[PDB]
Amino acid sequence: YGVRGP
Amino acid sequence: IVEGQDAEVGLSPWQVMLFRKSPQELLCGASLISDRWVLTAAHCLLYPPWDKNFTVDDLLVRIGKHSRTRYERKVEKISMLDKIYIHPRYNWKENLDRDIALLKLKRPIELSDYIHPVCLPDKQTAAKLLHAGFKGRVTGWGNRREVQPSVLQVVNLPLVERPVCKASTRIRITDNMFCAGYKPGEGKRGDACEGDSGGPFVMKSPYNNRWYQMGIVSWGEGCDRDGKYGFYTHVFRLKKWIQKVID
Amino acid sequence: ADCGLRPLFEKKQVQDQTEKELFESYIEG
Secondary structure: OOEOOO | OEOOEEOOOOOOOOOEEEEEOOOOEEEEEEEEOOOOEEEEOHHHOEEHHHOEEOOHHHEEEEEOOOEOOOOOOOOOEEEOEEEEEEOOOOEOOOOOEOOOEEEEEOOOOOOEOOEOOOEOOOHHHHHHHOOOOOEEEEEEOOOOOOOOOOEOEEEEEEEOOHHHHHHHOOOOOOOOEEEEOOOHHHOOOOEOOOOOOOOEEEEEOOOOOOEEEEEEEEEEOOOOOOOOOEEEEEHHHHHHHHHHHOO | OOOOOOOOOHHHOOOOOOHHHHHHHHOOO
16 A cells, blocks of 8 residues: 554 | 544544553544444554554453543443454555454443444435535544644544545545545645544434444545545445444 | 434534534535
């Protein structure tokens, strides 16, 4: 593949 | 949440904090869809590129909270998981397609004045409510900048139209995702950011007074960047699979 | 059918600080 994780 | 404000306590009951056991740590958002079922984004659990892969015995959930840190002892509920169901066609390798997950609670939940589910979308609601320009809402304890709130935050963002979302990124966008956000000329801001992931994008229906969960916070190219929008999982469309796990 | 209705809001018949906001965009332009 932004993965909105922390 | 970038460019939001504190939420009034009792604003978002279906707001779970996806926490990790040891060392304690927030990973995402999720929501209460029943008294034993929690909905979240799959990338919060399995995202190989960062060595990320969580098991039931790696997490906890702090359901019904307001201050992100001060564990509000007699209003909040921690719980362990029984299972983790991650969509079997979740594209983490390419575009994060079908980035959904359903988390089972070890044992049910005592709904409270600060805990209660959020309604899932039915064909009728989905049809009338999903139109560009139509604003929905995002809550979360994640970063307020691309740095973290003391209390839950809120931002109400408009659904952008299919062609404009696709024109902004070079990521293959699918039926299963939609985007929301303000376009460059609106001089209005807002976005989700690190840790708001898995959180819910809810819209209120005029017919009855219910809030429906329209989408799950998924990805974005930064946080509150001009000409960039935030992508959310299209709950309605993956609802077929949702029925399958909760059954 | 007890979903969606916020005890501290819906069930009490109280509106949240920015709920108004969402309702406008519905009848927009």
